[PDB]
Design an enzyme around this catalytic site. Structure first.
Site, short mmCIF file in Angstrom:
data_model
loop_
_atom_site.label_atom_id
_atom_site.label_comp_id
_atom_site.label_asym_id
_atom_site.label_seq_id
_atom_site.Cartn_x
_atom_site.Cartn_y
_atom_site.Cartn_z
N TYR A 124 -7.20 9.01 -8.84
CA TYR A 124 -6.34 9.21 -7.68
C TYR A 124 -6.63 10.50 -6.94
CZ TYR A 124 -3.49 6.06 -10.63
OH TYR A 124 -3.05 5.05 -11.45
N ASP A 134 5.18 -0.26 -17.14
CA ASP A 134 6.07 -0.48 -18.27
C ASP A 134 7.37 0.19 -17.91
OD1 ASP A 134 6.95 -0.62 -21.29
OD2 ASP A 134 6.94 1.51 -20.79
N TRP A 146 -3.44 13.15 -19.98
CA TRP A 146 -4.74 12.63 -19.57
C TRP A 146 -5.84 12.99 -20.56
CZ3 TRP A 146 -5.65 9.13 -15.92
CH2 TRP A 146 -4.68 8.91 -14.94
N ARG A 165 0.92 -2.02 -9.11
CA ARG A 165 0.54 -3.33 -9.60
C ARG A 165 1.10 -3.64 -10.98
NH1 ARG A 165 -2.95 -2.69 -13.24
NH2 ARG A 165 -4.17 -0.76 -13.52
N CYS A 185 -2.89 2.24 -11.41
CA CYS A 185 -1.74 1.37 -11.54
C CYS A 185 -0.99 1.43 -10.23
CB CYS A 185 -0.85 1.79 -12.71
SG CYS A 185 -1.60 1.67 -14.35
N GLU A 235 0.85 16.95 -12.75
CA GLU A 235 -0.09 15.85 -12.52
C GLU A 235 -0.32 15.66 -11.03
OE1 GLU A 235 1.43 11.93 -13.12
OE2 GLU A 235 -0.52 11.20 -13.83
#
Ligand SMILES: O=c1ccn([C@H]2C[C@H](O)[C@@H](COP(=O)(O)O)O2)c(=O)[nH]1
Ligand SMILES: O=c1ccn([C@H]2C[C@H](O)[C@@H](COP(=O)(O)O)O2)c(=O)[nH]1
Lengths: 262, 277
Positions: free
Chosen positions: A90, A173, A83, A170, A150, A61
């Site tokens: 990003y 989990d 994905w 931000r 995120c 990734e």
């Protein structure tokens, strides 16, 4: 305290003192705001031993972020489905900022402001800078994304030779995401520290709203029942002077002895 | 756990004890990844160990909120903190010679109100509104992890007379309580660090006022947290000084609009910092 025990008790924070909040799905979550962690990137690498973390998705990734290609199919060719075009994610933001987006079938080089390299350029020249940052937040592009980052940004700091990274996330989990992206942003330090020829000091992990899904409770309560095992120390075989030259085969992860997952 | 200004001083202490020296010719002591929580419930995190400039903090936000990049507007009110950079000696030094008096660059107030606008005049309706989008969203979806205002615009960074030191914040809503966490890339423990804590804690006080909410907390996350080598001796005498109870911020006017906010809408009850030295 020092190690994964930061994270491991971040669960006992949100499972005990965590506040009731709602998830965009509409499922319930236990939430907490403003946590912070420090993971040691010298002598070791912070891959979760409490539950086996997907390592090669963490690696593939990233290199997909360093490429600047926002797509599913490219990473699905690695047998990684985590994905079509996700939009300006990003990978785009890192390498190109403020560049007009069509799709990832268009070549977006030559454009924007490349953050990843502008961090590298600045480390070898200016020994000390607080302004070296990679920002994933562009409110104009964001509505075009399949999801807002995120991970808002990162920042790099060098003192006495050893590189440190803080990533501001931000939302995360504790069950799925943050363990994954702990490795992810601790992975990037190693890489840029490598090119810049610096060492690995620390990885500061900063969280905004940090939740636990109400399904994952008992699952998370099984995990904490497990004594964490010693982190791995990562080695880079081939010494690479380009950032886009890094691929899987240059990586060897030693010391991973996790627990049966779920 | 501390949660107070005791934490801020503990950072100064942990910086001063363990700080690493980074020379820019002016060297500092620097640590990385500091995070401090400031309770916004029934007290205002205005630092009592040494006096912070208040009317400056209050007048900058309004100067931030309406989108003003012009420093002359703060000076007419006799708040001069930003008037050095809009001073001709400064603009012609750094290559801004074509930019006039008070012209800073696109900065927080601009990036807040207009993101991806093109800096010149009247920018109304131009760019993205980061401030009005958050307040609109708090009304619509108080549970969101997507509420953020970011000042970082690498495209516009070179236009800025100085890059934003507080590069972005995030808002969080639970229990009818509005919180905020600001990520500051760089801050100076002796001058500007306590200053932003007031500005963001005020914005939270403001936003909670507009949205009809309460104030949970202000989480202050620092990037490089540094003390210039020359603040040290003067600093450590601020160490032995024990911070007092935080003042009471309140708003005597019910304000439905954030652009309608005025310096005359607040009163501070209980703020009495220590004398110099
Ligand atoms: O690395 C990651 C990437 C995604 N998420 C999940 C957490 C949230 O459920 C969701 C963010 O969606 P919003 O809250 O922004 O709507 O993504 C993580 O936890 N870690
Ligand atoms: O809220 C603020 C605003 C500015 N500064 C000062 C600290 C640095 O000396 C300088 C920024 O340095 P650079 O990030 O540009 O290197 O501004 C602060 O400490 N806090």
């Amino acid at each position: 305290l020092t190690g994964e025990l930061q994270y491991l008790k971040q669960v006992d924070d949100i499972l005990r003192y965590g506040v009731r909040k709602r998830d965009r799905t509409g499922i319930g979550t236990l939430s907490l705001f403003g946590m912070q962690a420090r993971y040691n990137l010298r002598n070791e690498f912070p891959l979760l031993t409490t539950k086996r973390v997907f390592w090669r998705a963490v690696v593939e990734e990233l290199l997909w972020f360093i490429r600047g290609s926002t797509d599913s199919k490219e990473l699905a060719a690695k047998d990684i489905h985590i994905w079509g075009d996700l939009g300006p994610i990003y990978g785009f933001q890192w390498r190109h900022f403020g560049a007009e987006y069509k799709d990832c079938q268009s070549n977006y080089l030559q454009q924007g402001i490349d953050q990843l390299q502008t961090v590298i350029d600045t480390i070898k020249t200016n020994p000390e800078s607080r302004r070296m940052i990679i920002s994933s937040w562009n409110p104009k592009d964001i509505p075009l994304m399949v999801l807002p980052p995120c991970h808002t940004l990162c920042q790099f700091y060098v003192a006495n030779g050893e590189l440190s990274c803080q990533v501001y996330q931000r939302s995360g989990d504790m069950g799925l995401g943050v363990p994954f992206n702990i490795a992810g942003y601790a992975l990037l330090t190693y890489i840029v520290a490598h090119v810049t020829g610096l060492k690995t000091g620390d990885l500061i992990h900063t969280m905004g709203d940090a939740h636990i899904y109400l399904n994952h409770i008992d699952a998370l309560k099984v995990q904490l029942a497990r004594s964490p095992k010693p982190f791995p120390c990562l080695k880079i075989i081939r010494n690479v002077t380009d950032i886009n030259d890094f691929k899987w085969d240059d990586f060897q992860l030693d010391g991973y002895n996790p627990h049966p997952p779920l």
